[PDB]
């Protein structure tokens, strides 16, 4: 079935241009529908930015209309958001949508002069019945990281906490999982950490200490 996937840099410098790509899968963008960009600010407010329609026609929110362009390349089933002259006010999660029904997963864009930095991943080692283990994902920028366990096979009992921005200006979170304490000797537990903004994947095996 149809799916939408945003891609783009997680970081844009103040006063520069933000460019995001929506890749549409299993649908021809010239066929039908209106293709929207919607963004969600920190604090969770939603703003509709504009569309490109099936016929290449545009409508933009007067909020942005001088700074925004929505274009497309049907040879790749992609449509694009360009936002000029970004400020800190433009830091948000950006979603591409088909009408109101089909939404991408969203892409976070942080407006900042700082460089990207990939995370350090440290084990949180089980110190019974069940036991908790996890990964401490520290010193990365900007958001987000995603954390999976054993490549997506372990999803029950997982908590990945919201990131906290440290005084150093770098983010940190933990991901933890509840696990049978009998499987600690024979079962391998690896946390899969993905930091898209720096194109860094880290795999860390969490072994009993």
């Amino acid at each position: 079935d149809v799916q939408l996937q945003e891609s783009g840099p997680g970081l844009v410098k103040p006063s520069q241009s933000l460019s995001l790509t929506c890749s549409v899968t299993d649908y021809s963008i010239t066929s039908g529908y209106y293709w929207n960009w919607i963004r969600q600010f920190p604090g969770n407010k939603l703003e509709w930015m504009g569309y490109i329609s099936y016929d290449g026609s545009n409508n933009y929110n007067p909020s942005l209309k001088n700074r925004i362009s929505i274009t497309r390349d049907p040879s790749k089933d992609q449509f694009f958001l360009n936002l000029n002259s970004v400020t800190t006010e433009d830091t948000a999660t950006y979603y591409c949508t088909r009408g109101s029904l089909v939404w991408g997963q969203g892409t976070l864009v942080t407006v900042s002069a700082a460089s990207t930095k990939g995370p350090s991943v440290f084990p949180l080692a089980p110190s019974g019945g069940t036991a908790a283990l996890g990964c401490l994902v520290k010193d990365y920028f900007p958001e987000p990281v995603t954390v999976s366990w054993n490549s997506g096979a372990l999803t029950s009992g997982v908590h990945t906490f919201p990131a906290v921005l440290q005084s150093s200006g770098l983010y940190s979170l933990s991901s933890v999982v509840t696990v049978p304490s009998s499987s600690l000797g024979t079962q391998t537990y690896i946390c899969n950490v993905n930091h898209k903004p720096s194109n860094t994947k880290v795999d860390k095996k969490v072994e009993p200490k």
Partner: protein, 216 residues
């Protein structure tokens, strides 16, 4: 533009009971065709918004019979019959009468479930981390309710202050509990000076405070 307003930032509800989420529009959403152009969305924790209701009262495909929309031209209600744990998240109304489309500020659904004590866990800094000259000591509180908890760090029985950060998950889609991490940050030098690192948790579900500790 049309301004969309949701007066309550959140609404409490006991699971199994019913709840109403309200929205107002600054202009009638009834068009010259009889349809009223109001959408309702749920955003569950970690996910994108999802369409529930379209044209004020029409159930979108896959959305249970428990959700229903009603209202006039300017005042709308999403009614959730027999609320389940899976219903948690933020509910947003959106008008699609005229461009620019606009959303209400959202209403979080808070499930008011029964008391549940936290399972507490403590984790020493890894050897890999100690190499960089910083020690992070993590205290984990799992699946508790209500949200309020007091987490106290004790190093050699000396109560800590100023040197920790907490993070709490959104209400869980499956059991409606919260989890919390508390990360204690010290230099390696400050870590090696002491022996007993302890996390003391106070919570309504605990008749007495649970302490977890380790020796360095």
């Amino acid at each position: 533009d049309i301004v969309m307003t949701q007066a309550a930032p959140s609404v409490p509800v006991t699971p199994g009971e019913s709840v109403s989420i309200s929205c107002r529009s600054s202009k009638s959403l009834l068009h010259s065709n009889g349809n009223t152009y109001l959408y309702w969305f749920l955003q569950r924790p970690g996910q994108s918004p999802q369409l529930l209701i379209h044209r004020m009262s029409n159930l979108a495909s896959g959305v249970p019979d428990r959700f229903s929309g009603s209202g006039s031209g300017t005042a709308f209600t999403l009614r959730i019959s027999r609320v389940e744990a899976e219903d948690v998240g933020v509910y947003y109304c959106m008008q699609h009468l005229e461009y620019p489309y606009t959303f209400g500020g959202g209403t979080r659904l808070e499930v008011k479930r029964t008391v549940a004590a936290p399972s507490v866990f403590i984790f020493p800094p890894s050897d890999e981390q100690l190499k960089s000259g910083t020690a992070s000591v993590v205290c984990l509180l799992n699946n508790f309710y209500p949200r309020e908890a007091k987490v106290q760090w004790k190093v050699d029985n000396a109560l800590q202050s100023g040197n920790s950060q907490e993070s709490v998950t959104e209400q869980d889609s499956k059991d409606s509990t919260y989890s919390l991490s508390s990360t204690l940050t010290l230099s390696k030098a400050d870590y090696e000076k002491h022996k007993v690192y302890a996390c003391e948790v106070t919570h309504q579900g605990l008749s007495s405070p649970v302490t977890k500790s380790f020796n360095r």
